[PDB]
Design a protein around this ligand. Structure first.
Ligand SMILES: NC(=O)C1=CN2[C@@H](CC1)O[C@H]1[C@H](O)[C@H](COP(=O)(O)OP(=O)(O)OC[C@H]3O[C@H](n4cnc5c(N)ncnc54)[C@H](OP(=O)(O)O)[C@@H]3O)O[C@@H]12
Ligand SMILES: CCc1nc(N)nc(N)c1C#C[C@H](C)c1cc(-c2ccncc2)ccc1OC
Length: 157
């Protein structure tokens, strides 16, 4: 199983200056619950924007730099190595890799942030003619989750 895992705003912004534009602890829990015990694959820029591999799951970084080496990260050097990865594999970022993978993945777990942020990194355009909506769950607003958001699980038609 090969999935995308992304949070993007109303205009598909996912990042701004190496940072997430919004603070949404519920979506952090969503990511932990979905990806704990499985594989995250990310581009080099996405990985270095995080700075450390995420605990309790496999961390795979795609780069052409053959000296790249981090404690806790397995390196791949081509898209084609993604297909050799076992288990449930989530493509985690960034814009480039999503552009490389959005036409290949089985499904997408999207968190839609119901906001318009300033961004410099974008998720690819997609249309619901190609994706059926398996589930659509509103996030609960509260104390620390101040922005409306919605958990979509989209499956390719
Ligand atoms: N929520 C997110 O996902 C966010 C991600 N962001 C944000 C934080 C938000 O910080 C962004 C960086 O500006 C960056 C914007 O540039 P982007 O190219 O989209 O980032 P990628 O993670 O997709 O990294 C691309 C790198 O992996 C790359 N890569 C992509 N495809 C291949 C490939 N097919 N073969 C070998 N390497 C590849 C190659 O790595 P390298 O330069 O060290 O060789 C490439 O430069 O995205 C990071
Ligand atoms: C939590 C944000 C998020 N949600 C969903 N549903 N999918 C994603 N792919 C990302 C993401 C992201 C970027 C790579 C990112 C994650 C994290 C992060 C994610 C999970 N635990 C700790 C940090 C920190 C910084 C980051 O960019 C600056």
């Amino acid at each position: 199983t090969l999935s995308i895992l992304v949070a993007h705003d109303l205009q598909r912004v996912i990042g701004f200056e190496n940072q997430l534009p919004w603070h949404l602890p519920n979506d952090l829990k969503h990511v932990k619950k979905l990806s704990t015990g499985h594989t995250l694959v990310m581009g080099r820029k996405t990985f270095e924007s995080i700075g450390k591999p995420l605990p309790n799951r496999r961390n795979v970084v795609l780069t052409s730099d053959t000296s790249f080496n981090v404690e806790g990260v397995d390196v791949i050097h081509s898209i084609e190595d993604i297909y050799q990865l076992p288990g449930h594999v989530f493509i985690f970022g960034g814009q480039t890799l999503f552009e490389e993978m959005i036409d290949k993945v089985d499904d997408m777990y999207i968190t839609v942030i119901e906001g318009k942020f300033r961004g410099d990194t974008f998720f690819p355009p997609y249309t619901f003619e190609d994706w059926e909506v398996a589930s659509s769950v509103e996030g609960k607003l509260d104390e620390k989750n101040t922005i409306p958001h919605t958990f979509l699980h989209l499956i390719r038609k």
